[model samples]
Target chain A: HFKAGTYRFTPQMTVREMLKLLESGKEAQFPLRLVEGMRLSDYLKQLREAPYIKHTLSDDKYATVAQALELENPEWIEGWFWPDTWMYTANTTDVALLKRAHKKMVKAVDSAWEGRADGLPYKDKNQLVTMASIIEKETAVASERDQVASVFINRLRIGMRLQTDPTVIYGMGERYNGKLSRADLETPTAYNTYTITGLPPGAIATPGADSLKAAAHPAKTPYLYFVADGKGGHTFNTNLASHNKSVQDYLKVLKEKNAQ
Target chain B: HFKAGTYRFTPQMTVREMLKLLESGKEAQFPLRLVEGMRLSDYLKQLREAPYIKHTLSDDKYATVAQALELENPEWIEGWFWPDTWMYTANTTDVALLKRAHKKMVKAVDSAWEGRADGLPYKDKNQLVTMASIIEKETAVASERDQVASVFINRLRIGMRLQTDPTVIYGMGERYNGKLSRADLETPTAYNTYTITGLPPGAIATPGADSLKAAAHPAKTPYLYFVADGKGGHTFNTNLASHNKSVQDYLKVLKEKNAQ
Candidate 1:
């Protein structure tokens, strides 16, 4: 057995450094970022590239690893690993890292579930993680988090589509070349929140603790829509008309920016 | 007038993306990082490389900018900027970012100073910042922060020299080629806490809020010495004899690790 200890992931640690640290028997420091709305698939891809781990896995080894961790139902595996600093050992297996992250996710979900607000539309803790992941993708601004949660919750409650671009992009997968087109939105997939009447098949990205909390206790508001303000925040509205107007203004700003 | 709003620096936003967001004029979300104990010189270097900001500065612009912010002394400029995400506008100047960071630093120091702990040896808020920066650099592990602070504080209380390596490296400036030699420590500079008996003229790097708090409220300990524990942490000692022993152990670990 390898000697194991805690590893704090700073925001700045790249994937390459992370693997090197695992190989380095001495205590190592590297930036670790498990940002809200980042996909586990992306992290796994990086992990596989590390020299120590590069040859360790065969195709579908992830499935076997998840199974060993008792992560039944492969669907839950997507957002199961909580985005946070984790403990690991020198020469730690890729499976170990995944297990630690999954355990943290479970603990956070359990704790959050214990203190969940009076009425959230989500059916289970997984759904909460899913909703939180969406909110995490929606806005990067701190003050806007709860408000963004409210808008999503409001939509979810009324059976209107979530209609978020992040999920649509998630559905697009590698096809998304950093630009969103109308065709991309029109394309249907399970993760296409725009066409889906409810929460997608699973979480589209890893949700941070704040996003989880926001999902459990969304701001008490009737905001059904939100669009970008000219500033680095969103303008919320209770109706589609106002959201459309904000969208138009956002487009104007975008056009003028492009002209520059 | 530029439309101004809050900008949250996520972990993912590189120097290039930061400038693109500023020029985009649309509310854009990107990752930002403001690490504690990092040099402001590095941040300025990164800002200068951003495409939108590259051609926007005169060679003497930073000096003029600092003066406009009422920073009459060059010494104050190093750790003046608080490490945190900030609000900005499209076409936000490099000086504006520095000014905001400095203002935040001032406010935090002012507030912390007003509530200074009783019987502390520090003469001013800058010392607290200085001590915090050293602590930020001393250990990567968070649990050891207060203990590291205690070592420095204990040394200060006894009028013993703080023989920390980070300060010496900082003092070495550009001459430090990632290797610490005997000559480097012996060569005296204003920042060499090892040779000097008290706080340096200025902070060597930016201090995070936690480090600041640790500096303000160091753990109540008489332990004046510490050395690496070989497991990504340090072993503390109350006297020179024990400290030397720990140092020897750390060297053994290093040798064994290197041999491997």
Candidate 2:
């Protein structure tokens, strides 16, 4: 227990001064006695290196001892949400440590999404996960996260297709590597929820919790459509038919130039 | 397009009031617009019923209309995040409206959680999800969420078997109906990740964003193990190995009379 109170001490206290304050005879009777040092700064530095000795005088009685502190032996701290530590008892290796850290990062991402305001447009994990995967895969800028969120929410609301290129690429799996083809978009797969209605069967990939949370609590906005504007940002539209026209225009230009 | 600052008058404006507010020929242009016997007091009384006549405004003039009103729509306001409205020119519905409202609620919950400044003890989504699931599915008290989180964190820190009865009961699934038996504890399943050293395969249910947020950012505490203490509250333990010993001692006595 910490005895909270004001205590006055001189910058430089002699052995005699400390002894007098401690009640000189108590040192003789106690198993561990307080000994005054010639240089207080030096003493403090040494004490820092040897925490137990300094802690004894500091009256951190409630503070767990080193032995007790070892009980949890936390492995990794989650980065995205709260900085909570985990102790993976199964494996005591560096690989385990990295995996734990990765998990923390992922979970933090999930937390970011879930902690958003309530009354989400989407229903459950599957839909949110799908939208989030697109957000994570498409935009590199953090500012775009909300915009990306807004775009997907709008799409779901208007009953237009969620023509997320990421879903197509994800459906292609290892076959596409990092590149997407026109055929990939046309291909049908269970994972391609964009071609279908509602949401995908399961998450495309294990999204960080932030992605999950973002899906559950997307930014409320009027934007109904988003298309890559050639710049870093995507242009938003409120009308689906107009958006389709724009997609057609962009695709036509790309086709003429053999960009597809 | 709505005329700038021309709010549709819902209440009976006296001729004097109407003349002062309306342009020269406006009052003469629209006569007998009032609902029968609508007075200020009665209007106030019937406020619960549609109290106002909303203006018929063109979407194209919204920007100018808003500027005239000296107001801007909030960033996350309804119709902002609709994908079809933004992507395709699809007609929206009430479902879209509900999504907007739901997103707002999630934001409020996020703010509440951030104010607490707590860190959950798990690094993985599975672990966090499991802890949150237990909190959500079990205890009736909202306050117990943190206590439940604390217990799971403590259990992970120490090498204690998470002997949570909820996991066992949940594992029984459709057959469980209502009651639980001791045999269920031994007949383990996938959801009971606690029994088998780590987290469940996935979130058993779709936790509310608040619960998900809590799981992501659990309260920072030393507690690792928690058990119902007969009363509504729970008793927390930091060392599960010792906690198990205590459980044995306590339950042994409770079992003497063949207690359930």
Candidate 3:
């Protein structure tokens, strides 16, 4: 085995690859399969069971990690790490890496705050990160980040529930499978934006820099709702009636896809 | 007219669009077409003439801006800004924005330095940034960053001239007319890595975080040369004979592209 050393990140490198490099000081044979918007619970679960990593933390250390990041609440640890292949040293603690990621997230959000458009609803910068996390989970398409942000922002300004499904899934925690039900939305946790009238109590997952920026400076649109167009993006609407029509259109697309 | 206010940034908002938001407190019709690797010279020229932006710097104020960023040499001012849709307060001085970008670049580079791979050829972090700037200019493909860094590092270790076209173009400054000629490569300047040995005096453009990370932790490859593959990336080789062949292949592809 190679001696202990630092690992440099490539853009496509994942947590599994990073762990392998740290343990053996060599590259992994294959890359781990990961999607862009994977939430923290899934990430931590994977890390705990990963073969090469030196996992010291217990399964219930979420609050401990949150305190290390100096977050306002322990629950806000969900969206802590920026969703990218971060640079890390060998023998470095996972907490240390998470701290760096948290700092990066804070820096990006604070910088966005320095240039925020006037009259935004949020009184704190963390709210923007929280909102950005939702948007990040809601869409994978780059073009829709700003549009999704606009919908959420418009809803916030008008005192409507965000009604985002990701938040409900997050609230479901370990019980959540690959599906969501009406009971999950009604089971109300701090993260259930569907039941909450305002932003979630905390972010559901790590948000990209683009999503953070989008939440900080949403498009100047009157859009209050969005539904998936089923072409891997969404259609925006300004009112309930238009949004209902969009929902029907989306259902049609989903039905067609299911039929195929 | 819109009242003086701060505008938050979406990741996609350009400087021109930011200005429009500040001026009208509304969305701009068009995004200013910009990319990550834009040089300071072009950036300053754009700002100086942009109608909504207020530019107060004289032609010779490069040194002043460098001073504000606390750089050691005025010539090291080229690759100072961190490329992104930076946040800005309405009526914020261009220098102020530059200062923020400089700080951001500094923070990112400094943080990466803490975990740099051992035994790099360069002596200082600035040199790493300079190398990263070259790599950033050399390729737009994320996968090519570490590979490009390895080529440059290998050449530096062996006392070979970088002979990169981007450095020569940077040395030419305003004389660059969207083309490179034999005379241009032969003409020596502080930034011409072709004539001058090792890394350039300073960075040629503001490098993104990925490039900086690549420079800090270069790939452990024995390869030392790369040329355009004509597929929006490069083909690497270790031996001069192989490199020459790759160059011919690139030229052939270029000819085909030009014919089309």
Candidate 4:
């Protein structure tokens, strides 16, 4: 007999199919019919009183498909689904898989869609995913995302490198761990900015709301370059001279800090 | 005390003067100085403690000057001043006088200034008091007062008779007793509509909020004439024909049971 868990939500199957399963009268892998909208404790009692227990039992082979088997912990047994499944479906006949499924669906769809008019031309899911990854990685504040989106779009328009520092971190994979060192930026990898120009191969992390909003609605400034302005915020510069001055100021502040 | 009832709402002072008195220490009719925005009950208690006992005590002098001051009921004496006093007073000190004083002031100003722009020009006091009286006498319905105000303004602008029925009731003096007939309208008192044109020499009653709002900001219709339609609402008309028709309709339906 397959080890099993009880269902919380009813599925959308017809009553005829459910009654058929009930008449089978053996250890069933799935619930025949959940009392729709039953409370948790009552549903638990239903599991004990389940009419068909042995019907789904198999000795050697177990079903791998998500629809074929119901699990109390689907993620533990099966596999991780996409994260965008949060937007769809409200009912729970079996359990809370609806939320996870919706969240995953939304994540994939969101990744594929153009989050921002970030002037990049994209042909496939890979490019979109790459952009989503960058968007997710770059945004520190939600309100700032649209501006960032604009900057990235402008960069793409000018055919300049999306010289994101985070790509370098993604290149190190597990070795990238949590922190990025100066050596890590210099290290040559297909995904690393010091080694390559443009977006790294694919996403490194899930984009959050700010990054999404930023990607969707970037700022309208004209500058082509951005640098951490020694202060916590970034300074954008139109020319190398301005950029260099900002960089010099930042470096001077860093040197003074070291000397202190 | 000459009599406890001698000092109710003495129609002697102007609202401006009363407001000043309330502002100065001359009239903290309220018992407690209201805390700087304390709870209303506490403020009321303060007002109760701070009665314009001076005004109450000084009735003899006020009554000598104003005939209306001779009549008062215990309810007016012992009861809390109306809530409107709170609204009119710049500070809580006027809360006591706010009820009677403000009403009296509005009445005095209205009577002194009552007139039509084309015929007998309202004295400055009469205009305010007339406006105030019309405001006080009408329904509490805001919309009704606004419409009524429009009708009055239209009368002034077009030089039509301000043939207000309430004025007829007033002109009928003690005889009106809340009942009226064509005879009442035909009565030749200066305030009677059938006899005199334009506004009567004085205001008819202390107007209510709706009346006030109506008097000040009547509807923007071209209506110059009106009669109480059978619906307990007025039927307003722009011309004499419609006005006469409405009056006929109202009079026809009115059960003139007691009139000869």
Candidate 5:
């Protein structure tokens, strides 16, 4: 289990930081840990002296985890965990904290599901959450989320694979280094969005509220493709020719950023 | 021309009341008229005196009329003409009043179109407006409009004809009395929902703001049928079996009402 006394949000944190917090204190000797007001990577190791976090993975069960969480493993517990604040007080166990977080997650997902638009491609509420997770990793700009969602939805309507890199990286697992290669994209995995016909088997990360909202009610748009402009956002397009123009522009921007 | 002094609003008015006010005093000698403190039908005829009503419906032209207005005749000018209060005073012509109302209708339709959901079975903005008009005729219970829209949308998605009575009555036109016969349903007409494979060629009536909103964003539901429950509103159902049950109950109520 982990603990916190109102760490008033830092907005940006690495995926690894989240994993450490959730998976800590599994061994009976380790009581609890906390997100300190410091670099999360270094701070996590300060307590991780071969910390065997017993994150109960029988690799099978709980709504058939793959359907409920959409994860072949357990990384599907992202947005639902509600990591904002926790009272890991006088009497606290990892199980207790998780149960509390799990309750909140159910409420959030249910609320999002209730207000979703009709005719979306999702088979169920859980599938929509997986869509939200993919959206969460695509872009960080709040305004761009709905437009990115529109592109994916439009693609789905036209029978196109998502072709997103984040899912490929998730499928890559330990094979992913600091960079992705041409061969990496071509080699297929269950989570590889480019190779998959529809959605992946599970979520890659826990999506936040904005991503969930976008996934539930995508913008009414003709957009079929979106590529990063390298200025912290993406340019969306309806057709391939214009999309290709933006893709080339983004390529030039990458070279400039590298040169600088 | 006609006028109103911000005639506050009485919410309920007959369809004939609207018609006389629109078609009165079209002769060139007539200058202007007003919707006065009066029973609309009687008051309209008081000034009407065989009013010429130079309503130039050449039966062709203007966005090809049919595509834009979706009407064989010009009654399609219903909702587009905002009748809140018009300054039909001092100097006025029918053309001016129509042009002014025309501008507002375009704005309203465009705004509604911009916010519509994707995958709805409308061919264009005009088609959606026709949908809103049908929804208006379906129910007077404000809360039920979206549900009514959902029933129709669900039917359309499943390739079922609307099979509604209002469209049949509309198709009957002047032949309609206070009652309908089985033969009326079997007869084909441009506006007959029962005989048509899709939407009718034109709307049957003017839809208000609520109906327009409902058509743009139908409620999420599995309902495929609805029939009057004889208690001032309708009973909605998912399957034909339950719908048939409601129909039988309504027929019993009709017999009781008739006996009294």
Candidate 6:
């Protein structure tokens, strides 16, 4: 009796039939993979760079598909897709695959919204997704999601702008080439946190269940700032001076690493 | 040699002459008194009720005086007075007395602005003064000012409305008669923080030096909500549930007080 690493849910199947298929714990091998914390822009880059998804989902076709995923009013594409390892029948239509992901994301966001902490500033589910995306972009460590969530919540409490970098990068679009400058930080945009009083107008990436949950019910922390530790972690600080010193240390560590 | 509890200088004196008069420990017999944290509305009520300054500073004259102090742009009058003990020669004019208070308030605000904490959200000294007025109205205890400041800052960081009661009462104007109703809370007004985002358009009361400094450089805290204790102090909480429980306990205690 071998345990399977995947499950198949087909729309054509009756409820009982789908339950039976799910009990098997096995699905087909035609996989549609999406990593968590990726943006639609990141997806577009992947579509252009990778060859595996080329023939079935051409660059033009993928562009069209992105619109179907709400690319036009496109805050949708950034946070709406479930970052799932989707396995479908070889003959599955692209629209069906999109629907499957959308359905999953909708359910996840709804559940997160239902369990959100009372008295939070987020007005709707989209805002929650917006927060989740920001949290997802801010950290990679599983443990830090709650801490990041707490900082955002604290900032919102006092009417501080959510000065998040990812939102700026997302707004920069084709202009961002893996480097951010002080000029970029100061420039006014709908997404520029330096200028905007609160959350950016939209999501920046596809946040997963963990990020979503953390945004809904954040950890209790007094921290107002965080600096990257250069070791894939962060040093959280309660005030500007403390945060500045952590950043100074971080820069020092990076300089040493480069010298080595 | 004895240190005096107060000092005085006539507006008629030049700056050098005033300095010469200030060296003397004694000045005049009549006193013009203003306690810190009183609202302009409070001042207006005082003008009507108090007999001491009635004939010379009549109600119509005081209303005109308030306008001269920028009552037409009413936000100004709230935090624009320095609560000083004024001792003038018996013939001292009311307008001259007002100029003294206004000048002191301006200098105090400017000094606080110059030494403000780095990266705070106050765009201008007025917003800073607006914040201080809220802090003034929130608590009578000087020790709690910084904590109150921090909570407001934290709320602003995340774009929460100030949710201050004083702004609402200030808006209620003649309608506010020592008691607040739930109906007043839900009703919309430009000054109602329950509905408006960020600081109110104007100041609500005269904030002293302590409150001004507190607004300029808030303490470091994770607190998001605060509730009044039966004692003069407050209980601060980091989340909604915790704050709700604090409120619940406060009510229970209040009920017991009434029963007793």
Q: What lDDT does each candidate get?
A: 0.70, 0.43, 0.68, 0.46, 0.60, 0.69
Q: Candidate 1: give the clashing pairs.
A: A9-A32, A10-A32, A13-A31, B9-B32, B10-B31, B10-B32, B37-B206
- TM-score of model 2 vs. true structure: 0.29
Point to the candidate with the largest lDDT. Answer: 1
The runs of at least 3 residues in candidate 1 whose Cα sits more than 4 Å from the true structure, single-residue gaps closed, are A1-260, B1-26, B29-31, B54-57, B60-65, B255-260
Q: Per-prediction DockQ, in order?
A: 0.01, 0.01, 0.01, 0.00, 0.00, 0.00
Better of 3 and 4 by TM-score: 3
lDDT of 5: 0.60
lDDT of 2 by residue, B106-128 (tens): 45444544554444445533445
Give a tens-digit lDDT track for model 2, residues A104-194.
Answer: 5456555555665665655643445456655655555556667777777676676766666656765675676554544555678865645
Candidate 6 retains true contacts at a fraction of 0.00
Model 1: residue A113 alpha-carbon error in angstroms: 50
Locate the minimum summed-lDDT window of 10 residues in model 6 chain B. B2-11
- The deviation in Å at residue B247 for candidate 2 is 76
Model 6, CA-based lDDT: 0.69
User: Distance from true position, residue A123, model 6, in Å?
Assistant: 64
lDDT of 4 by residue, B1-260 (tens): 11111111123546665335323432112122222112223333334344223333222232322333333432122111122323221122332443464455445334333432333234444454454455455443344566677767666666666656566666765575444544566668866654676656555554444344344445667776656554446676777677766666654443221011
lDDT of model 3 at residue B120? 85
Q: What is the lDDT of residue B165 in candidate 3?
A: 78
Best by TM-score: 1
Model 5 lDDT tens row, B38-136: 112222232233222333334323343334434445544434543233334312333444465556767888898999877788877767777777887
Residue-level lDDT of model 5, residues A182-244, one tens digit each, is 466678999887778888876666666777788899999999877766555678887878877
Q: Weakest 10 consecutive residues, lDDT, candidate 5 chain B?
A: B2-11
